[PDB]
Amino acid sequence: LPVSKSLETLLDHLGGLYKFHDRPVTYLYNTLHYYEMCLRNRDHLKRKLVHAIIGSLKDNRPQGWCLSDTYLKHAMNAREDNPWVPEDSYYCKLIGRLVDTMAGKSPGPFPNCDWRFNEFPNPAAHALHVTCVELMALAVPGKDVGNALLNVVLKSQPLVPRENITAWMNAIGLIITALPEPYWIVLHDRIVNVISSSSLTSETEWVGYPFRLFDFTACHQSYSEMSCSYTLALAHAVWHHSSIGQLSLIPKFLTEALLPVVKTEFQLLYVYHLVGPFLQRFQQERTRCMIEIGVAFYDMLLNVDQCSTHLNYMDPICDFLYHMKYMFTGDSVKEQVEKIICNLKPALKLRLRFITH
């Protein structure tokens, strides 16, 4: 840690290193993979490396990077504690910039010099590393990234509009699929642990009608805006954006944590809303885990068979699983599911006696 100030002075003597391209995304990822959890020494190093990297990047005059200068103007004194407190509203401005990158003030200060040599196929490419360097400042982010995002979602700041929300959804999806693993890893417990069992077991409320509210786009009015709905929306966003390698850990996840949480049937509809619409992404390249997902759902059946008196909307799940089998898996997982569906309820047997065939 201590003599690292000498290499800081050295890079100050080597500003020319950053006179060609600003692509520290990979240089932070590969050197931060297992570091965010144990960054304490690197945290104290960044305590002084913040201004060092800022000046190293400042070897230009397009006045394009403001979030760094915004932190600088917000870091006049005691830079170890203050600039990380009001981040949510700050993040608003952050996501604000992003929600202005696609439809807003397009000819802004961001695209310039020269739109084709600063690695500009799109302003989001520049959004990448600025978001990275912003969230790489402290250590409590990454764990706090998804938390603050969910906050600015439900604790909607007066700057966050409610009509063009889907742009913000795409924005959060991009910023999540851009940041490394210890940053988006919080979304698992953000969806399954926070609200998926808020009360949601037997006497939740008269809100039990699942279809009209649990699916998104129901909050088109100022009414019909449930927290579970916005949570599912944030989910689907991060699912579609990160549909490259982040989804690859999802099957085991469902087998690890989603088992002792499913109690009621609308919990089953919720986890279906979470998992289903992205299975074809696996089918494209990751077929080898589909069966897992399959039996995962099948395992859920067992639960919704034990602690359950009656099933009102069961036939939706029946035909859902039917087309799950016939359109995607086919005669592939027959032997594994044979030993698991034998424990179902008489109605489920009467529904899936052709599935077992």
Partner: protein, 124 residues
């Protein structure tokens, strides 16, 4: 309710209760879901459309419509769930959707205290 409040906030002593009875009995008539719909109505406005004195008209219309539904519950039906527990689960369903009151606070800037005060006033 939206149209009536936006058109004539006055001169509406009790025709609106008549139209409410009409649309209720001449349709699926769940009293809890009924009051849920009417509450979502009287709060979906007052936030999006108005910007100035129209918001004052909106809050006045809400605080006139709540005695309307009150006397509706008093005179319409009596003998089976006399507008006591249905109102309970109605306000529970209301409390379920928190973004409603979130937008209410984003609009009125005091929707917590003002909400409690209008609640205890309607409890007259």
């Amino acid at each position: 309710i939206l149209l009536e409040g936006t058109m004539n906030l006055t001169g509406e002593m009790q025709p609106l209760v008549e139209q409410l009875m009409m649309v209720k009995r001449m349709q699926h008539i769940p009293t809890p879901l009924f009051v849920l719909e009417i509450w979502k109505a009287c709060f979906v406005g007052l936030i999006e459309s108005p910007e100035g004195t129209q918001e004052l008209k909106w809050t006045a219309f809400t605080y006139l419509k709540i005695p309307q539904v009150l006397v509706k519950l008093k005179k319409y039906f009596h003998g089976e769930k006399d507008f006591t527990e249905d109102v309970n689960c109605a306000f529970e369903f209301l409390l379920k959707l928190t973004p409603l009151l979130d937008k209410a606070d984003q609009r009125c800037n005091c929707d917590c205290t003002n909400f409690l005060l209008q609640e205890c006033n309607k409890q007259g």
